[PDB]
């Protein structure tokens, strides 16, 4: 009653006490600061190695840290570990759940993970002493569909699900250690910071939350989107990140500034972004629309430098290699193309 | 040396052999999404085909079907429903003997039909609990007109075949419900996908064959659409 009304006004006044601080720290803008920077111009990139062999739609992929091997997942219970240089299918892991929505390649390359509507992030050991690869273990305990599971170390994995929770696990014993709560919507994507001491998470509530891995607290929350956030990725330096939502725009938020710096919106574009990945320098942003093509944005001018028009369906998953050599791009046409 | 190259090239050939064998079984199995609500009766539908996410495996005339009951997830669908944009069909189950929650089923139908990703998937609509509908209509305590004001202005369609020795009040109740789902289906349907409504009870010795017959029809019409015949 009176007590509940006091809490609503007390919490709302804090938002009023933050928004004035946010607008106060807006003396300049990214758009006018970089008005004189030499434009990127036109970025033309053509397909180099189209990878074929997925029966069903490709839902997600991940690059190895060696910038050579990538792993892809498709809705037919197949994890194929591709060799990008030579187009050679190193492994084709058969999955118990034909419905997988994410996959991550470990930085050591010893393991790979995947999860989806099975509600479990399975870990597959690629250095088994025997011929084939098996299931290392099952990380059961989540309630919703696993939307994104990236790797911290060989023994720490961070997962986000449809139950509005990001979880950090321990593969050695398969029990959840730290649970991140605070989202009011399905969580769709993560991003690990380059220092791995933080990670930002975008959910289906137009809010991206920065989390602290070792503490298990959401230290800061970024709002300014209008619809579900479908992908998120840090800036290469780890001092900023960018998001893609269903309202057909991409927004770059600054961690230190605390507000959105610049939005990447076009009048012709009315399709939700499905995947975002920065270039190695951070000067380009690559956004994979479900308008059947990817657009290479000037990350300090909001100018479409170029378009990667080569897909016959929704662009599912997009990634850039660590060295920034080339850009893979899965899709729902079951074909994972590599651009450069 | 190029000795390692030969080993990689033969492992790719071994992989490709297994992928071809997995392609044959993947195309020979029809995947179905089994939607519905808390009281819909998908539980008793899967008991007929028994002969987190849950899969039901059955065959009719030596044709394998996969049915997925997505049960483990939350009440928000807008992001896990996009996974099933490749399924042969949606098996949608509705409780025809609960008029209060019947409007919920119509809104869910509308969102599925008009989805940017599912606008090509046909629906095998199942109106379960027809037995409970018979007794409720003859009870007279609950009125369709209480929930649906256009039931008063509705007549039993000419192209309707009542069951042997059936009360005609029930037939007019049944076919008003059916027409409510079909009314949505035809408003935006552009031949990309079709609805296949059916009247089933909890005691049917069927709905394995009905799905098989409707699945073959869905597969027939995509061929003709490719041929520009339809």
């Amino acid at each position: 009653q009176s007590e509940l009304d006091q809490l609503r006004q007390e919490a709302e006044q804090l938002k009023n006490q933050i928004r004035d601080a946010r607008k106060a720290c807006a003396d300049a803008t990214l758009s006018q600061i970089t008005n004189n920077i030499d434009p990127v111009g036109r970025i033309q990139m053509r397909t180099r190695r189209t990878l074929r062999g997925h029966l069903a739609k490709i839902y997600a992929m991940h690059w190895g840290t060696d910038s050579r091997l990538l792993v892809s997942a498709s809705q037919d219970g197949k994890l194929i570990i591709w060799d990008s240089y030579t187009t050679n299918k190193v492994h084709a892991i058969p999955l118990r759940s034909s419905w997988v929505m994410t996959c991550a390649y470990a930085p050591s390359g010893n393991y790979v993970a995947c999860g989806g509507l099975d509600n479990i992030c399975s870990i597959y050991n690629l250095k088994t002493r025997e011929g084939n690869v098996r299931v290392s273990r099952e990380l059961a305990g989540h309630t919703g569909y696993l939307s994104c599971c990236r790797f911290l170390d060989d023994n720490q994995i961070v997962t986000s699900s449809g139950d509005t929770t990001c979880a950090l696990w321990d593969i050695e014993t398969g029990q959840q250690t730290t649970t991140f709560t605070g989202h009011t919507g399905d969580v769709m994507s993560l991003s690990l910071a380059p220092d791995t001491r933080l990670f930002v998470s975008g959910a289906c509530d137009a809010s991206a939350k920065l989390w602290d891995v070792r503490e298990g607290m959401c230290r800061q929350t970024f709002t300014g989107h209008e619809s579900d956030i479908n992908a998120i990725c840090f800036f290469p330096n780890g001092n900023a990140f960018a998001t893609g939502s269903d309202d057909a725009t991409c927004r770059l938020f600054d961690l230190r500034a605390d507000q959105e710096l610049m939005t990447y919106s076009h009048d012709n574009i009315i399709c939700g972004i499905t995947s975002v990945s920065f270039s190695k320098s951070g000067r380009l942003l690559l956004a994979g629309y479900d308008d059947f093509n990817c657009n290479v944005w000037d990350a300090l001018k909001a100018d479409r430098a170029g378009v990667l028009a080569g897909h016959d369906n929704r662009v599912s998953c997009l990634g850039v290699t660590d060295d920034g050599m080339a850009v893979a791009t899965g899709s729902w046409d079951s074909f994972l193309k590599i651009w450069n | 040396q190029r000795n390692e190259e030969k080993a990689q090239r033969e492992a790719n050939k071994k992989i490709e052999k297994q992928l071809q064998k997995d392609k044959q079984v993947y195309r020979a199995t029809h995947r179905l999404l089994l939607l519905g609500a808390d009281n819909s009766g998908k539980s008793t539908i899967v008991k007929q085909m028994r002969i987190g996410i849950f899969e039901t495996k059955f065959q009719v005339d030596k044709v394998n079907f996969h049915m997925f009951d997505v049960g483990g997830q939350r009440d928000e669908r807008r992001k896990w429903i996009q996974c099933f944009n490749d399924v042969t069909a949606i098996i949608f189950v509705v409780d025809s003997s609960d008029y209060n929650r019947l409007q919920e089923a119509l809104n869910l139908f509308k969102s599925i039909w008009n989805n940017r990703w599912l606008r090509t998937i046909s629906v095998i609509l199942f109106l379960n609990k027809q037995d409970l509908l018979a007794e409720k209509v003859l009870a007279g305590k609950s009125k369709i007109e209480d929930y649906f004001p256009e039931f008063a202005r509705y007549t039993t369609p000419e192209d309707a075949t009542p069951e042997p020795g059936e009360d005609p009040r029930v037939t007019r109740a049944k076919y008003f419900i059916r027409d409510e789902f079909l009314r949505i289906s035809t408003a935006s349907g552009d031949g990309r996908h079709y609805c296949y409504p059916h009247f089933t009870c909890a005691v049917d010795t069927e709905n394995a064959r009905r799905i098989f017959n409707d699945c073959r029809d869905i597969i027939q019409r995509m061929h003709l659409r490719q041929y520009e015949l339809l």
Partner: nanobody
Amino acid sequence: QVQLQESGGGLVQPGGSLRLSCAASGFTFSNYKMNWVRQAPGKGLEWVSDISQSGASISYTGSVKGRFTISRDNAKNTLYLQMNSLKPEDTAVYYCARCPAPFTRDCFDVTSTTYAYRGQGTQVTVSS
């Protein structure tokens, strides 16, 4: 920030009239289809009505059909629900739900328990 604040709602005699105003902020009101959903005491959320971007396509739940009137004003970013007659059965809290994706006809999860894009809502009470 996507915020939806609802006005009106209050004690009313049966067969009276009341107007609900939903003010939208932090998004282009012009693109998202809107909705009205009500939660009766000890009962799940029910869908009441929806309105398209241009107001052309309007529907209703049937239990309120031709008695509730829904209108939107893209100029002021305001969504209305004109209640003409007030049956005692419609005693519930009214939320001003917004469809998730902008340029789509489909409107999933507006009646979910924990939906993100649904306002706080105002309790509408009808009694003698």
